[PDB]
Amino acid sequence: MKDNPISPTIPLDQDGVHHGFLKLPYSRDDSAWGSVMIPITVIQNGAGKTALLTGANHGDEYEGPVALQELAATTRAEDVTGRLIIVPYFNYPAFRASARTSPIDRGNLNRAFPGRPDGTVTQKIADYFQRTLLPMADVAVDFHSGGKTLDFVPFAAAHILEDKVLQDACFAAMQAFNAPYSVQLLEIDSEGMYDTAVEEMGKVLVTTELGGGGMSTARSNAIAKKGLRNVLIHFGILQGEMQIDPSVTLDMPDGDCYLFSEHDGLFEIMIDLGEPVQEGDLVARVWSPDRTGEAPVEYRARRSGVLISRHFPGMIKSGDCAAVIGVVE
């Protein structure tokens, strides 16, 4: 396989604090000899694990990026035993466009793995992570949130894996994160995902869904920072005492959606995130976007639980997931 064309502007394996870029050549109409300059910080000191920390895998998901920018700007080499490789804006082009996917190639980075060194920009990013960065990491933390179109109760997630020893390691790392909700689930759609790239190498992956709507709050930003610091202590890279608060564990959500809208319209949710519903209760109504006087279409809960995910925008489209009802363990 050809070598990936990315070259860092900083060394990745030297002691100290280094701030620079992954330079990905990108020739196009408005820059014949141009590049995508992906921000990166490496902090390395003494002996320990290397953690690869990413935010904005999707460009409209902000909690991880806030936590990672602060981490990169405020952590001293002397506080670290091991290595932090910090990339707050993973699909950097998508992040710059405030979009889930890249405006260069419409690439969903989270489904681009293992990528290729001679493909689209998004594929070249994936390939560099697959073959260059991940092999130097022992563990990975990849932050997600709902994005502009979805909102979730704030959870950390661990995966059901064939390797039960790794599964337990991932579960322990997820507990350390200590988000207000905790999940362990089988990933239905594992092919091409970043999580799969990490896990199939035998490495612990920590992942989240920390809110959504294309925004973040002080509370959600604080969940990301605590969770990040906690897992970094768990991995032995940072030192100190972990913050431990109550967490609500959700029964195996099957990761699937059952309340798909069959109509475009004005979206009216009937309960808010985290709140209970009984089987048959109204979860949402879709009102006509183009006339008055018409009965709304109703979406009812198929079982009892709490609302764990919702369509975010005021307007919903045919085929959109309206809501997901989860079950507290």
Q: For Ca ion, which is the closer residue by CB, 35 or 81?
A: 81
Report what 99 binds from Cl ion, a copy of itself, Ca ion, none; CB cut-off 5-8 Å by kind. Answer: a copy of itself
- Residues making up the annotated binding site are 81, 236
Considering the rule CB under 5 A, would residue 81 count as an interface residue with Ca ion?
A: yes
250 closest CA partner among 176, 164, 314, 183 = 183
Residues within window 189-248 making contact with Cl ion, judged by CB under 5 A: none
Going by C-beta distance under 8 Å and a sequence separation of 6 or more, which residues neighbour residue 30?
none
Considering the rule CB under 5 A, would residue 101 count as an interface residue with Cl ion?
A: no
Q: Which residue is nearest to Cl ion (CB)?
A: 110
Per CB under 5 A, the list member of 4, 45, 91, 110 interacting with Cl ion is 110
Going by C-beta distance under 8 Å and a sequence separation of 6 or more, which residues neighbour residue 32?
none
33 C-beta neighbours (distance < 10 Å), count: 7
**Interior/surface letters 128-146, b for 16+ CB within 10 angstroms, e for the rest:** bbbbbbbeebbbbbbbbbb
Residues within window 87-106 making contact with Ca ion, judged by CB under 5 A: none
Q: For Cl ion, which is the closer residue by CB, 33 or 218?
A: 33
Size of residue set near Ca ion by CB under 5 A? 3
Q: For a copy of itself, which is the closer residue by CB, 47 or 188?
A: 188
Strand partners, 87: 54
Structural tokens at position 114: 């293992």
Going by C-beta distance under 8 Å and a sequence separation of 6 or more, which residues neighbour residue 277?
271, 283, 301, 304, 305, 306, 307, 325
Residues within window 224-253 making contact with Ca ion, judged by CB under 5 A: 236
CB of 117 to a copy of itself, least distance (A): 11
CB of 269 to a copy of itself, least distance (A): 6
Q: For Ca ion, which is the closer residue by CB, 13 or 251?
A: 13
Structural tokens at position 123: 């594929």
Residues within window 24-53 making contact with Ca ion, judged by CB under 5 A: 48
Q: For a copy of itself, which is the closer residue by CB, 202 or 219?
A: 219
167 closest CA partner among 143, 194, 141, 185 = 185
- Could you list the residues that contact Ca ion (CB under 5 A)? 48, 81, 236
Residues that bind Cl ion (CB under 5 A): 110
